[PDB]
């Protein structure tokens, strides 16, 4: 955990995030939806629950990205919920929720669900 | 359960379904997305798990509606997952998943999530 989480992570589709896990449960960094460009870059913030593990459990964590920066304002936010598992092939497995700001007529269609796995390679 | 489930159910927004709970776990009927019109009417099918209850548990169930009939073909299907609770104020509390058929580029945005409660009144 902590030192294990700190670094660069990649998913299947070309997205990258960079995170520092801080001593008292903090997670901070940047999500880049495409590894090339300097603003597909958005702020991330989250938390993780550190614990003594004796049985090969994952570490529960979560983070939020709001989709606004100097180039784009998509009127939406995503949360990822999941766990870190370390080792030779460390991964973070997540499920996510994306909500867009709607009028109240459209509120029932505001939230998408999906899943993502991140690796160090 | 069974006799308890059989009948007409209403949600907050004006939708209605009519269901028969059959002796060996079957659920069949029609969902009408608006109580007025004779085809906002679509076929439903599902299952429920009947059990001896001694502690005031709900009955787990689920059903599917594909959104095609003689008037509309929306290229989508919804599944509702939840439980029936009986009594003076019997309700069915659900969460749902709506998936639309997409091209593979659009597959990550294919599924919405939400929730519904149904009552007899």
């Amino acid at each position: 955990a902590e030192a294990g989480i700190t670094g660069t992570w990649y998913n299947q589709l070309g997205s990258t995030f960079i995170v520092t896990a801080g001593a008292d449960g903090a997670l901070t960094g940047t999500y880049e939806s495409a590894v090339g460009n300097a603003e597909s870059r958005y702020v991330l913030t989250g938390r993780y629950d550190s614990a003594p593990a004796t049985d090969g459990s994952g570490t529960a964590l979560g983070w939020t990205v709001a989709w606004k920066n100097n180039y784009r304002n998509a009127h939406s936010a995503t949360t990822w919920s999941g766990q870190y598992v370390g080792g030779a092939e460390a991964r973070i497995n997540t499920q996510w929720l994306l909500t867009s700001g709607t009028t109240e007529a459209n509120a029932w269609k505001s939230t998408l669900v999906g899943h993502d796995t991140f690796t160090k390679v | 359960a069974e006799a308890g489930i059989t009948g007409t159910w209403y949600n907050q927004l004006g939708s209605t379904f009519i269901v028969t709970a059959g002796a060996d776990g079957a659920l069949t009927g029609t969902y009408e997305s608006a109580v007025g019109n004779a085809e906002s009417r679509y076929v439903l099918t599902g299952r429920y798990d009947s059990a001896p209850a001694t502690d005031g548990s709900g009955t787990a169930l689920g059903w599917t509606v594909a959104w095609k009939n003689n008037y509309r073909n929306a290229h989508s299907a919804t599944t509702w997952s939840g439980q029936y609770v009986g009594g003076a104020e019997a309700r069915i509390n659900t969460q749902w998943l709506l998936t639309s058929g997409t091209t593979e580029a659009n597959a990550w945005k294919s599924t919405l999530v939400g929730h519904d409660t149904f009552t007899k009144v």
Binding site: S40, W67, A74 | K109
Partner: peptide, 6 residues
């Protein structure tokens, strides 16, 4: 072309 993937 949402922010998340593009």
């Amino acid at each position: 072309c949402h922010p998340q993937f593009c």
